[PDB]
């Protein structure tokens, strides 16, 4: 599942997961996930909180995001992008399932979103970067 997975796509707010692994070269237990976010929306999106959960055999860890908001889309310029790292410990090499909780505000509404991600690269190939 090497290619970038779209975790979220509504109201023109997209969140993708990008896959990698570290840090002992030797090991194949921790997956690095860079989660990138772009907006195409006409009104800006602010107060972004992305949470994640995993099954009891695994462990997830969310580093602070590069930011918390995105401007109204201005197609003329380079788009703004939020980027966040998350680390997924799974030494038992069990099946990979993740459940996110997305929170953001756009105009006067506040979206409280939840979804499942299952398209992870199989734990075997985590050593191979």
């Amino acid at each position: 599942n090497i290619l970038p997975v779209t975790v979220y796509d509504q109201h023109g707010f997209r969140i993708l997961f990008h896959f990698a692994r570290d840090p002992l070269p030797g090991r194949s237990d921790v997956l690095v996930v860079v989660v990138s976010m772009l907006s195409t929306a006409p009104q800006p999106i602010r107060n972004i909180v992305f949470q994640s959960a995993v099954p009891k055999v695994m462990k997830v860890k969310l580093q602070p995001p590069s930011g918390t908001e995105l401007p109204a889309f201005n197609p003329i310029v380079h788009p703004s992008a939020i980027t966040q790292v998350l680390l997924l410990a799974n030494p038992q090499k069990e099946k990979v399932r993740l459940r996110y909780k997305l929170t953001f505000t756009m105009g006067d509404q506040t979206y409280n979103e939840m979804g499942d991600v299952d398209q992870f690269p199989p734990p075997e190939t985590w050593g191979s970067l």
Partner: peptide, 8 residues
Amino acid sequence: GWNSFQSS
């Protein structure tokens, strides 16, 4: 099942 959700 699974653990609780995790924040930043």
